[PDB]
Ligand binder design. Structure first.
Ligand SMILES: NC(=O)c1ccc[n+]([C@@H]2O[C@H](COP(=O)([O-])OP(=O)(O)OC[C@H]3O[C@@H](n4cnc5c(N)ncnc54)[C@H](O)[C@@H]3O)[C@@H](O)[C@H]2O)c1
Ligand SMILES: NC(=O)c1ccc[n+]([C@@H]2O[C@H](COP(=O)([O-])OP(=O)(O)OC[C@H]3O[C@@H](n4cnc5c(N)ncnc54)[C@H](O)[C@@H]3O)[C@@H](O)[C@H]2O)c1
Ligand SMILES: NC(=O)c1ccc[n+]([C@@H]2O[C@H](COP(=O)([O-])OP(=O)(O)OC[C@H]3O[C@@H](n4cnc5c(N)ncnc54)[C@H](O)[C@@H]3O)[C@@H](O)[C@H]2O)c1
Ligand SMILES: NC(=O)c1ccc[n+]([C@@H]2O[C@H](COP(=O)([O-])OP(=O)(O)OC[C@H]3O[C@@H](n4cnc5c(N)ncnc54)[C@H](O)[C@@H]3O)[C@@H](O)[C@H]2O)c1
Lengths: 329, 329, 329, 329
């Protein structure tokens, strides 16, 4: 007799608690919490662990989600600065890092973020030797390359959020113009998560109907190219208006964790090793259409690129090697 | 003082209950309940009304869903043989009708189902003058034509479930072979909901990549045509094994009610008036890619059909006119 | 022939777009977007309208949600400073207003927020004469009183978010201690959304088992009273750590919009007219357990309060009248 | 070069597919598919395996769900008569067995179902040594006892669906009368899943308000006892109208699998070992309020039963021992 002793009986038998679908969101900032509320809301994990160097912020964000437990189906929300909190995660999502000030390219953030990465990746792997690492930080393509190097994980367990967002942005504008739910519109953005992103004009379709063979001049005149245009600009506009981007990437990331936690084998433009494809010579990471499952990237989809697109992918891959080349370890 | 008087107070103010997103599923059979449990589960309507001539069956099915209210977010489930139960529905889904015995074509059901239709459509319209009618009964293409004629509703408020299912079936097999979630696979089935269904080989794609320009011989050799093959066969197999088809169409229908109840403007292969498209001369109904909203079909998507497909659509449209022609009113 | 003309056909028939389940979130701040992302995610409305005086912030938040359309089932997201944007809303959620600086009581915000209210309520009612107004702003109890007065709407269409959050907070701590999902724990917080909130010790239960008759001393010794304690403190902690509260109220609000948009008739502690209950003499608003539907508060639940609780409710109602009394119109 | 070779590339790295949240529904009948469509729809497992002795029926049901993959988030649906198909399930739900003909008590099914059980339990455990077994078959209380004996699994990994349904049925009728969503109504049914079920009159509440102290005579006069009445009758009515019960138990079961697959620790009336509680002397299984997690029953909730209820539980436990006693192994 205590309250709990008087209410709660026990059977002869029982075993230690254990969570089997754990996800760790590293970084409890704008993007941080956006990914975290998305996942919570999609009941993707039975456990969510937040990690951040900022200790007050972490605990308040933790607390704030915990007060909402009644309204969820995620049995455990934990948090701490010590990476021990993240042990046995199936997915580790990284969000730590400086962000773009307005007008600053994502590429300008490489040194700042490499330096954070160099501290975070050892501990991650330390505590979850078999996880899948999902980088979101910018410059996301370069950072997925770093994370892979520093980590030594099989290439397939390292993914960048990459162009999933870009392609989402593209298909929303397509939708806006054709007057069709973005989900019914099919168009792909690959290459860098940034200013040198390639738009696959010859893949664009609504119900398998090629926009290119209907228009022809698509790749160029009628300001259809503006769609690509608004796509590269979009991060910059949102930043100047709002200050940062949060909610689109939370969703874009949750989409990705779903395919993974459900072993769904869906095609998503994310960041991978592009070496040996389309004549690329180096260890460069960029988005291509990838098949994802519960163990990472299952397969890459080989795109039959037109001459100009293929030329665009080449450039993309180039602006990024000139950056990796000079990465000091 | 009564139980309720002692517990439940009242404010000075209040107004009559009223439901604003009502859906009536007419027919409480296999397909009946499949559509009904799908919708319930997607919280699409604030009210669900079932109607059937079979009075014991209706009330038990009603009862059975009602006992599950705690586990739902649909405030009202009602039922009755008198079409008064369905008044002010935003969507009316018809499921009443004989079904295929094994080996029987859907076309063989026309007389049986016309005769039911002739009793059901007047009352429907009677009680919900502004609804959207969704036919599911077979032969679904012919029945959406009947329903339209007998009803006199603006063509856009009359839809057949049509090829939404067929195309779902197609993309599942595509998925099975490429090793990609059916949702990432894009392929379209149009024409009749049946044996003369046209498969658009030149629309087939994964990430905007045309399977046709990669293969070429697609429309013919390598048994890729078998996919189309298994698609026409599928209803017949399921029937001989199981006796009928239920769960695939429930889902296919819910998908459709969603786009409608959410005014989402998504593209779905459903049955419409094909007159004046692809050289079709008559008042024939078949599936084409349609844009749907909260008021019905918003727009048709004009497909750039290849010579053989276009020839297939023509045949389809023909096997069906020879049937409508002879419909006695 | 244009792109769209070549792709998109038309039937003989069609009708004007119109949305039928519209919700307007007034205020695109922390709480603002939390309520807005919750609702979006629960597919509660076919249309979401944001309104704010801050024009850059509004448009960027609008834009940011729009870029996420593919990942939702809400056909329309709109925004503007002119209340015309909100016309024909079924629900209007108000979030505009100063917020607590750390250590500041919610009561200190009355003058600031009355002054905003005096500008916002006329236009709301102007544009949606039949809506349901949901106040969230603080001090929420006083503001639902203002909104009602200035508006002249039937008392039942005016609701405060009130103690739904408080009671959520209570049941999370209960859960934490008994070792039971907060949803399986039943405990109620009523009275002011603030420091004088009454906790109904004699309603507390897990599976209809009264914690009070098991403990007895519950209302006082064993620090069970600390639960109430942490509940009043909670807003203040989160504020000092994080700066404001957002995510718990977004969820708490969505829960409320659900019951409404689904005509579910669920019991929620929200703010109403308490006049004539428990000896209250004045036009005071506080949370009591209310039945909600698609037209507002359907019914109040009469609580059989114990002598001390009833005494607590009285005090609560008193600290709030001393404040309404002096409201200058 | 093959289709797939031309489209699908490979990284240097990759690992064997594996599913980590597997559920096996044994029995592809009415109840069978109801549980299976519920779970599918709640994205509870990354893999669903159906097992049945009836081979045509199994494969067609399998096929029928597979054709609906596009419309789900469950990567794998499998099926087979050989229990090898079920290896490494986290949850095994048993549905195999005769069902009640109208007017037949659940108790009459014991011999028929024991005999099936004796074949099924060895293979289950054979193939998934660490699973959680969920019995649904009738008489469910007796069958969870059998399953435990024959299996030798730690008592906590064996659960009966039990009174979760009964209590759902109770709270729907409560709701019907008070005019409150069944979820806001709290009332508990324990004891046998059948004719001797005990209703806890003294636990009944809406917002922690005791219906008993408001009424007093509750346990007896005013036909409030009819609610209990309709609860025991309900299975029998549905059977005579419809032929069997399916959809309520599918949902009731999914609710249960959720708490389990999400390690939510929620309280559910299910079947357990009641030995040593309320003076029960024997190895009897009946529903009591239990805390469930990812490893089974975590804890029992000790109810403070009134004298008559406690007397009811005793009887219940007795009608069931007289049946177990004589079970021939
Ligand atoms: N790839 C995409 O689509 C995309 C989209 C938007 C934003 N981003 C990027 O996301 C990152 C975060 O953006 P933000 O707006 O949330 O920034 P922000 O100001 O919120 O900073 C994020 C956080 O990272 C933390 N952090 C710093 N060093 C840390 C360390 N050693 N360990 C753990 N956490 C640490 C900070 O304490 C803070 O919580 C930036 O790199 C930004 O460029 C990427
Ligand atoms: N288009 C599709 O994709 C598709 C898929 C499968 C099944 N179907 C069709 O669905 C229809 C029903 O199939 P089923 O398997 O459920 O058949 P079924 O045996 O269950 O018959 C359906 C029901 O319709 C009722 N009905 C008969 N006349 C009625 C009337 N006047 N008013 C109301 N209800 C009445 C019956 O009482 C019964 O409840 C059949 O036409 C079948 O061919 C269509
Ligand atoms: N009741 C609850 O549970 C609860 C919980 C938390 C916060 N709140 C309250 O929510 C309100 C907003 O809190 P916050 O943290 O989001 O504050 P905040 O700083 O974000 O301010 C909210 C916004 O209101 C806008 N606003 C100001 N005047 C306006 C006008 N005339 N028309 C429209 N919008 C106008 C501002 O531009 C800003 O967008 C505060 O009153 C806070 O106390 C209530
Ligand atoms: N506990 C509850 O709440 C509850 C509710 C309703 C129904 N039930 C029970 O569910 C059980 C099934 O009911 P039903 O209506 O679906 O019956 P049913 O006719 O559909 O029979 C179910 C199935 O079990 C299969 N089966 C028989 N022996 C088998 C074996 N050795 N291995 C595997 N499968 C085998 C049959 O082939 C068939 O697929 C019955 O015991 C019924 O009483 C329980």
């Amino acid at each position: 007799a205590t309250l709990k002793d008087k209410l709660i009986g026990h059977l002869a038998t029982s075993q230690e608690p254990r969570s089997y679908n754990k996800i760790t969101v590293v970084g409890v900032g704008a993007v941080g919490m956006a990914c975290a509320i998305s996942i919570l809301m999609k009941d993707l994990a039975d456990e969510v662990a937040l990690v951040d160097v900022m200790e007050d912020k972490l605990k308040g964000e933790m607390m704030d989600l915990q007060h909402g437990s009644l309204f969820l189906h995620t049995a455990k929300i934990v948090s701490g600065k010590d990476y021990s909190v993240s042990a046995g995660s199936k997915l580790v999502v990284i969000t730590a890092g400086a962000r773009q000030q307005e007008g600053e390219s994502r590429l300008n953030l490489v040194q700042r973020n490499v330096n954070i990465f160099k501290f975070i990746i050892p501990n991650i792997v330390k505590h979850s030797p078999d996880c899948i690492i999902l980088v979101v930080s910018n410059p996301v393509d370069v950072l997925t390359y770093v994370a892979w190097k520093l980590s030594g994980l099989p290439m397939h367990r390292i993914i960048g959020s990459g162009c999933n967002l870009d392609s989402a942005r593209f298909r929303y504008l397509m939708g806006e113009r054709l007057g069709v739910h973005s989900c019914s519109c099919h168009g792909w953005v690959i290459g860098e998560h940034g200013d040198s992103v390639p738009s696959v004009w010859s893949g664009m379709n609504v119900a398998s109907i090629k926009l290119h063979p209907l228009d022809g001049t698509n790749k160029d005149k009628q300001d259809w190219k503006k769609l690509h245009k608004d796509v590269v600009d979009s991060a910059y506009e949102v930043i100047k208006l709002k200050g940062y981007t949060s909610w689109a990437i939370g969703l874009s990331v949750a989409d990705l964790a779903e395919t993974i936690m459900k072993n769904l084998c869906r095609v998503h433009p994310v960041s991978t090793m592009v070496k040996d494809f389309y004549g690329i010579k180096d260890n460069v990471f960029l988005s291509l259409p990838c098949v994802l499952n519960d163990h990472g990237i299952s397969n890459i989809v080989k795109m039959k690129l037109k001459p100009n697109e293929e030329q665009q992918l080449q450039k993309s891959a180039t602006t990024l090697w000139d950056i990796q080349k000079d990465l000091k370890f």
